[PDB]
Amino acid sequence: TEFMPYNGDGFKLLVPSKWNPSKEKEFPGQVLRYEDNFDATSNLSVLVQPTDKKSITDFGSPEDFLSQVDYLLGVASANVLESSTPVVDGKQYYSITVLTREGGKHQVIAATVKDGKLYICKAQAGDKRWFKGAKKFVESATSSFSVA
Ligand SMILES: [Zn+2]
Incomplete structure (x- = not known):
């Protein structure tokens, strides 16, 4: 209904069914971008980049990863x-x-x-759209993200 599954190269996730794919490359390693065409500040991206790390925990804590x-x-x-x-x-x-x-x-x-890849899913919305319904979309997309 409001969510649709997406299968990429080595990953899957749920994208909101009303958002549309964008052909514009915003970040390096960008392989997917979806955006709300009524408010493009609501959007999501998946990035895949090579790495020498073996675990996400090689980055240190979550807050350390965030800084990198x-x-x-x-x-x-x-x-x-x-x-x-x-x-x-x-x-x-x-x-x-x-x-x-x-x-x-x-x-x-x-x-x-x-597999020598760092897989990143990032989803965002503006504060007002967040409380008006976007929170569900942002949190489902990132919660649903899984690799194989
Ligand atoms: Zn806020």
Whole structure:
């Protein structure tokens, strides 16, 4: 109904059914981008980049990882609402929720390491759309992200 599964190269996730794919490359390693055409500040991207790390935990804690992929957030200020270290089907993931700025953005990052690749899912919405229904879309897309 409101969500549709997507299968990429080595990963899958749920994308909101009303968002559309964007052909524009915003970040390096970008392989998917979906956006709300009524408010393009609501969007999501999946990045796949090579790495020498063997685990997401080689990055240090969730907050340490966040500091190393901070280009993804563009910030006068970043506030970490929550972080977690969920394990899905054997794989360690990190998940981080960050609020950046009046003007506010809620960004959720989910990440794991597999096969000499760093796989990053980032979903965001603006503060007002967040509380008006976007929170569901942002959190499902990042919660649903899994690699194989
Ligand atoms: Zn907010």
